[PDB]
Amino acid sequence: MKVQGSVDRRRLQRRIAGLLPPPARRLNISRGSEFTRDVRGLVEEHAQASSLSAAAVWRAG
C-alpha cells in the first residue's frame, strides 16, 4: 500500500494470457464416455473453424 508501484501485475498477467498457444486436442480411445466427449468437441471445432458466418473463424485465424 505504502507505494503504488509503477506496473500492474493484473495487466501483465492478462496481457500474457493472450499469447499462450492453444492446447493440444486429445482423444481418449480407452473409455467410451471420454471418446464421445472429445468427438463432440471435434465436430464443434470443425464448425467453428470453417463457418464463414461467425467471427470465431477469424479468431482461430
Place this chain on the structure above:
Amino acid sequence: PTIAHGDGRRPSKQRTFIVVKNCHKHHISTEMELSMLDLEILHSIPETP
C-alpha cells in the same frame, strides 16, 4: 399422348421415353485480406479510451 389412326396400317404403339437429366456444379470464390495489426490488437484487451 397419341392419335388413334385407321388408315395407318398398324396401330401406333403408345410411347414412353426415359430422360436422364444431369445437375451441373458451379463453385464460387472471393478473397479478403486482413492485417496482422488488426488480428493482434483484437486479441489484446483495451483498458484506456
